[PDB]
């Protein structure tokens, strides 16, 4: 499983003609680059601790593409405002998700190109990389404009070429800092409640990445399962509670790094 | 290696 994504954000400012553009890149759900407009000296800055293997030619060339993208979203924000005939006062947000995932062996499996205006979906490139999917009447205007020009061929060449080729460079430069997994530590805390019942809580502290599954298997198969939250230092944490009256039960933990499921009471 | 868009919205 190896992936690469480019999450672009464009939030306009009330009254100001220049909005704020944010381009953040990810390699296997891990951020390595970040660009901002409100920062003093807007340039691409290395976020990953292994991004020192790039010369000044890479940081200047990427800065050029970020400055160009900044102008593209600036115009597209005004073009979209007129489509819905929105009031020229408030601030609006335009987002884009462009990239591709390969899998175990390094080969293209699925390309991705999506656009979303104000959280809601707007236009997306299909799996065939030739036709587009629109959300409403205003999105159909963008579709005919991009089909008349033939923009589908331009985006197909990036996802097949430039994105795959540059992902191989990152995968080889930082293979030791990417393939690093940790076993999750478990502990169950006891808590009494009304009517003589006991609430059990299966904790999991210290795992990377957050792709984990905690299920309550009672004698070989109502439950309160919360979303995974990060610790902050570079690891993830998750817990699951069950309301059962009063007797020891087990909770199966499924992790990709662990060959056998780790489960232990108390 | 970020992508570059051609035709505006």
């Amino acid at each position: 499983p190896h992936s690469m994504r480019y999450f672009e954000t464009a939030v306009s400012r009330p009254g100001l003609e220049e909005p704020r553009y944010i381009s953040v890149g990810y390699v296997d759900n891990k951020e390595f680059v970040r660009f901002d407009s409100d920062a003093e000296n807007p340039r691409y800055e290395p976020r990953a601790p292994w991004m020192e293997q790039e010369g000044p030619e890479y940081w200047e060339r990427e800065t050029q593409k970020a400055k160009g993208q900044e102008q593209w979203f600036r115009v597209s924000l005004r073009n979209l405002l007129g489509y819905y005939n929105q009031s020229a006062g408030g601030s609006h947000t335009l987002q884009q998700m462009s990239g591709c995932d390969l899998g175990s062996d390094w080969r293209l499996l699925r390309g991705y190109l999506q656009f979303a205006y104000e959280g809601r979906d707007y236009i997306a490139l299909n799996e065939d990389l030739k036709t587009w999917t629109a959300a409403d009447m205003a999105a159909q205007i963008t579709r005919r404009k991009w089909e008349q020009s033939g923009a589908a061929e331009h985006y197909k060449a990036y996802l097949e070429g430039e994105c795959v080729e540059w992902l191989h460079r990152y995968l080889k430069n930082g293979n030791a800092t990417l393939l690093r997994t940790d076993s999750p530590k478990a502990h169950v805390t006891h808590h009494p409640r009304s009517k003589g019942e006991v609430t059990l809580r299966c904790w999991a502290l210290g795992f990377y990445p957050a792709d984990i599954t905690l299920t309550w298997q009672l004698n070989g198969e109502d439950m309160e399962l919360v979303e995974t939250r990060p610790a902050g230092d570079g690891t993830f944490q998750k817990w699951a509670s069950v309301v059962v009256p009063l007797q020891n039960y087990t909770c199966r933990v499924y992790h990709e790094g662990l060959p056998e499921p780790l489960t232990l009471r108390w | 290696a970020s992508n570059e868009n051609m035709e505006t919205m």
Epitope: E57, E60, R61, Q64, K65, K67, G68, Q71, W72, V75, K145, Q148, S149 | E4, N5, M6, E7, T8
Partner: T-cell receptor, first 108, second 115 residues
């Protein structure tokens, strides 16, 4: 900046000579033009990276560092006499930066 | 397909104003206006990125410009002078200024200002 070489060139019929465009900084792409009898510019080649050939002419931008581009002319003919210009796309505000020009003259 | 540019030639007296039109069938977002004098390289005067005038070039405010729609763009001279006699060129590219797209040039318009 873009430095064009040579300033002027004189060839006999059938002579094979080449023009060179040298860039101080790295460029995203390059374009070669020939100036019209009326004074305007007609585009000859557009190169992203590689080598393009269209008859007697052949331009290249095969540099890994992207700091130079050449324009080869094979078998010079009197119908090729004129001023040639090279312009690279900077990748910044004011997209094209033009060279000073080369005045080619082919004697029959 | 190509950059249309009319008229072929323009004759105007010193003081009198001059209008210069330009048009393109393609949906090019960036348009340019160059000035090419005899024995000289074309000098950028201004560029437009979809109704956005970037007059960074031309540090003396010697030119005016108007781009009503994506297809049409104009170059205007308020008061003509002998300094303005040159071949005016119009150009267009697919992406933005920072893109590496081919810049297509028009056939030009030779202007000569007379006393």
């Amino acid at each position: 900046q873009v430095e064009q070489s040579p300033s002027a060139l004189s060839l006999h019929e059938g002579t094979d000579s080449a023009l060179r465009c040298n860039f101080t900084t790295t460029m995203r792409s390059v374009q070669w033009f020939r100036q019209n009898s009326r004074g305007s510019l007609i585009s000859l080649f557009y190169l992203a990276s590689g080598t393009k050939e269209n008859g007697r002419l052949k331009s290249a931008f095969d540099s890994k560092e992207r700091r130079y581009s050449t324009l080869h002319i094979r078998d010079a003919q009197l119908e090729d006499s004129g001023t040639y210009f090279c312009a690279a796309v900077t990748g910044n505000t004011g997209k094209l930066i033009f060279g000073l020009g080369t005045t080619l003259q082919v004697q029959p | 397909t190509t950059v249309k540019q009319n008229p072929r030639y323009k004759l105007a007296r010193v003081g009198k104003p001059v209008n210069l039109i330009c048009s393109q069938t393609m949906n090019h977002d960036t348009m340019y206006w160059y000035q090419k004098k005899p024995n000289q390289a074309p000098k950028l005067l201004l560029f437009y990125y979809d109704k956005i005038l970037n007059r960074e070039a031309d540090t003396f405010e010697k030119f005016q410009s108007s781009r009503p729609n994506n297809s049409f763009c104009s170059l205007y001279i308020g008061s003509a002078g002998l300094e303005y006699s040159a071949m005016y060129l119009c150009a267009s590219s697919r992406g933005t200024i920072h893109s590496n797209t081919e810049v297509f040039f028009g056939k030009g318009t030779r202007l000569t200002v007379v006393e």
